[PDB]
Amino acid sequence: MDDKALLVEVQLLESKTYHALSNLPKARAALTSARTTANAIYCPPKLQATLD
Amino acid sequence: SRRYDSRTTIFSPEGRLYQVEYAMEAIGHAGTCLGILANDGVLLAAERRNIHKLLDEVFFSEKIYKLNEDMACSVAGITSDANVLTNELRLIAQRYLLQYQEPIPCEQLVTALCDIKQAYTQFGGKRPFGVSLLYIGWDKHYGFQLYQSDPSGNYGGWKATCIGNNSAAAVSMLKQDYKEGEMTLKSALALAIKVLNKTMDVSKLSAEKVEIATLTRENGKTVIRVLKQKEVEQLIKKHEEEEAKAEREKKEKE
Amino acid sequence: GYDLSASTFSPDGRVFQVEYAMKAVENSSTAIGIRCKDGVVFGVEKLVLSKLYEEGSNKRLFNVDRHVGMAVAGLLADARSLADIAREEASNFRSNFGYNIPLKHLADRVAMYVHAYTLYSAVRPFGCSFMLGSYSVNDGAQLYMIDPSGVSYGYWGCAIGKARQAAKTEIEKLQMKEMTCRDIVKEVAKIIYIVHDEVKDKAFELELSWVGELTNGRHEIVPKDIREEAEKYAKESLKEEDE
Amino acid sequence: GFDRHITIFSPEGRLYQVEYAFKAINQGGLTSVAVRGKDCAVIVTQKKVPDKLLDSSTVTHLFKITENIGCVMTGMTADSRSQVQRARYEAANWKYKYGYEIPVDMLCKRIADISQVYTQNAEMRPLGCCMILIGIDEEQGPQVYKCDPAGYYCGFKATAAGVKQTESTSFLEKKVKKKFDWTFEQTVETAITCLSTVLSIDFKPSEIEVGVVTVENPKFRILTEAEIDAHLVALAER
Amino acid sequence: AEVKGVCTEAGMYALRERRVHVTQEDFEMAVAKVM
Amino acid sequence: TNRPDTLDPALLRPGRLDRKIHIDLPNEQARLDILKIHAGPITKHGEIDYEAIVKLSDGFNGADLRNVCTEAGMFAIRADHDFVVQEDFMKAVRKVADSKKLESKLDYKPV
Amino acid sequence: YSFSLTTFSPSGKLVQIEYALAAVAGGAPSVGIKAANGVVLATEKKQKSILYDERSVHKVEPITKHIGLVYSGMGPDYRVLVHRARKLAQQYYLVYQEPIPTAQLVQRVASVMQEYTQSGGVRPFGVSLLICGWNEGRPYLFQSDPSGAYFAWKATAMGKNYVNGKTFLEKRYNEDLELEDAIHTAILTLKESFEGQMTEDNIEVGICNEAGFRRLTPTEVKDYLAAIA
Amino acid sequence: SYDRAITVFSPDGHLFQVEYAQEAVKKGSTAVGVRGRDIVVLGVEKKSVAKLQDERTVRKICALDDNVCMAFAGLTADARIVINRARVECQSHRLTVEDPVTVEYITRYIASLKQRYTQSNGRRPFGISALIVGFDFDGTPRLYQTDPSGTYHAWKANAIGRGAKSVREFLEKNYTDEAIETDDLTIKLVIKALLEVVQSGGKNIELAVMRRDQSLKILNPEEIEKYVAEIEKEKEENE
Incomplete structure (x- = not known):
């Protein structure tokens, strides 16, 4: 169900969770997925700042 | 003397009716439809231009309509003109039934609708019906019959024919590989499938892109049934198997 | 937007064939009508195109009813x-x-x-x-x-035809609301003669009428004596202006 | 192909003859403003009599469709009178057929449907007049509606028609941003001052026509010269 | 043409993140931006 | 300009032509002022209903009102009078109104 | 006139109907989504000033206690077509004392559009209609075209950005939706193209379920907008 | 209520639209008609009948009554309209007068209909030419040709359509009492006339015949082939 906005938010949360728990071979991948998904939408300022 | 008249029903410097032939080529642009006769029954396949994913399925058909108990038609061209023509066909058939207490013969109904078509092409300033009809029916005079009528009001009886997009190629193929005193419904369905494939080469004949309606006789009653998705998929799979086998045979020979 | 039909609007939102009808209207000789305090007096500058016609051969004053007359x-x-x-x-x-x-x-x-x-x-x-x-x-x-x-407007003094503007100025030079018909007849004759263009049309006849209380709310052609007196008044006015 | 008659759809829509009907409405030369208060509806319109020979009593763009419904017409005056007669006939027929006074919204719907038929058929032209109807509805209060030669009949809190339609609409827009709960005098003054400001003219009691319907007196009244002068004097003093 | 634009924009993303080698993330972002 | 609709949008841009002011046709008071300005030097020897002249001058421009004054003077000379009167002014304004029938669209706006 | 003004072009196309389609596509956005238990017709009802009383002219109109109808295109053409649809429904009821099936109503409105395409002195209707209905125990959404052709839709959009709306509906739409969820989807699709803040008054929505078609009040539309913000 | 003048005189006194109807006729398949002692023969070019097309539904030869038949050349829809109207009129004539129609009577009726359509409002001419062949009650062969303009003449041999001119000159030559003595010889003459234009015989040919007051009979393709074969025999004997 493509919206990409809650998708970017959830992928950022997963990135943070992996950063906290499973080091950064998976947090980096989740962050890359979030950035790629965000690049296809407007990314309101809050979401863009969270990404950055 | 009007400036806005547009002179729909006039002749041309040559005896060529511009509006009628523009309607003919509108038919040509419209979706494909074809019909095949066979000793056991008649069938009518039709490409579907409503292949959009968000488009619901509420009727039993979109290109194919039922005129009376033992007769169906298929329309190519303009959908609204087709709807009005099908309503008029139903009215004509039921008027004949009310008057004579027996189903209207297929040729008689085709002639009546074509009389209406000719009236529109000769009288008044109204544009002709840009619709071509393929009628498949049964009657106690010549049994299973297939007719094809054009916007000009001209109809012809055929054993196998095609109207619409790539209709020329479809009719050429049918001419090449249609057998007169043979080809029961099974082979007729196979032929229709292969013709639709080579007529819609762009798409590999997805079962959802075509509609087939078969008219047959059972216990003295006439049954007109639209082939379900299951049967259409079975037919497409069989044709694909046959085509692969033919290609393998040709390559092995070479 | 062409001007070949009344069903067509100009790009300016202006029906041109109606304007052409009005153009045809302002080519007839002239017709004034003055609403006095106790009546209405019509006068028409009936141009005798040829001397072969009889006086009153092209009556531009019609009796639409007992009490209504149109010019x-x-x-x-x-x-x-x-x-x-x-x-x-x-x-x-x-x-x-x-x-x-x-x-x-x-x-x-x-x-x-x-x-x-x-x-x-x-x-x-x-x-x-x-x-x-x-x-x-x-x-x-x-x-x-x-x-x-099709624009019906009430007036105290109106003029139609070629010299409608000149007739309008001549009419404005009157106290119409307080005069009597018996004198407005003379004034109308004077206005007709003033707005008439002798060098342009030459031959000329004046067709008068009124509907008022003196006629019991009935439209009639002006009696011959009254019409002659009004014509003489107009002639003497023109002579005085020339002098 | 043919932007000469309505039934052609120049190849993006754009019914050019209907647009030309609107241009004719503007070309009429006059302006009219309509407002509605908490309990009153008012329609002012510029009154021009450039002759001194005209009766000045027959030069009126305020008409009484029925005893309880009034209207102000803008644009071609012949078309205005024709549409006013049609509106009166429709109102009378509604009263005869249904047994109660025609609502203003329904009346505007009737005339708008007729104008839509004109735009739909090629034989006719869309007659170039703008009608603004005023009435008191038994439940909706002071209804004010405006029908146009295309068949649009939206109901308005305050609208205008004529050459300065846009400026009048902007002025009424500014006024209705704030405290739209207008008494009878307040709404009459709003309409009069809107017209005066838009036309850059100090109005004498002569060259304006004011029509009013109030809940207490739901009878379309054309204010006399004395009442118009009283309102204008109060406006000047304030 | 769009594929070539994707390659060029992947290079541009590698440039934006000052770096000498274009990577999978750069190609992903390039595809997202181009389409 | 009097044909602003034909100007380049880059020229009409707010950065180049910042303030676009509309010198519109005179309203009632504007016509009264222009008529007074252009009839001040004319030796009038009557009572001049400038209000009536303005009422008949609907749709006129400033040059049209100046021509109204000039035509009143023309009527004066043609009548061999060393002055002007309201009858002359009324004739002049009606003459100019008739002359105005040969015009075309004038309400041209930018954008 | 009696001579048709919609004639076939040398390329076999009805340019008059094509231009009516262009007029429709230039109209206000509208969306129709049929859920598992109902249908929703939403539309942009943006006025050009707050002067316009947005409670007199309704963008979504009911034609029967189980059928509603929204449009995209010319408002007056929509008015005449909705009046004709109401008359057709009443005639059907009178003949058969049973509310007209949605399929039949759309068929007859399409026939009206076709006969206005064919007739002599007339113009094709410059509107596309989005009938919704709850005959039987199923929801129906039909789009009727200026050409007089009617298509059954699971969900569709017509207006300014109708192609974008249709893509959005394809991405966001599933057969398992429920009426209150399809309303969310419809308002979200309208927001996809809406130019400005979407107030509860400058938008209009009408639902159609077992109870019957009803145009949601501005209060309910406000609540939906708040839930969707 | 269209009420528009479709056919009007051109500045040089021509009815260009009935001329265009005649052009529509000339661009139709050839139809030949001959009359002999006791038989009227009526052949027509099948004009590329597809293997898949039921030849019964193509009817360029139609029986208007028991004693009158009609060969067509033009627009098939107008063919059907005129043929149906002629059949109705023939039954009406049988009603009013207890005799079968005469070929001249039916030809006159068709011509009157064509003229009505050529000078009625909002109606274009019937773009068709017709060959009415039949027998009267007195037992006399009759052949008439009617043009779209409502002019009908009585002929001894016509050919209307694409090869009208060539077939007409061929029939003008080699048409004589000796050549029409027998029914077979008359059929030979018609088939030769058709062969003069149709590139391939047999396939592109359809013959109907009417003997004296018996019935209309459509010659089967085998019979047509036999006639063509013996025509070839006669030709090769000559050469």
């Missing part, structure tokens, strides 16, 4: 058609409701007929503009003007 300007055929239409409107009104048609109502009905003809392209606008005049004891003296577009 037309433009195409005489269209003017006669509109006069017949107004006559039948008045007759129908009297037969249906049982009393003389008010001039305002009759003018509105005829103007709406003219609008009916200026609407569609299956017909053409009337090529004549007319003035209606009446007097009644219970409704005063009323004068209306209707043009090819």
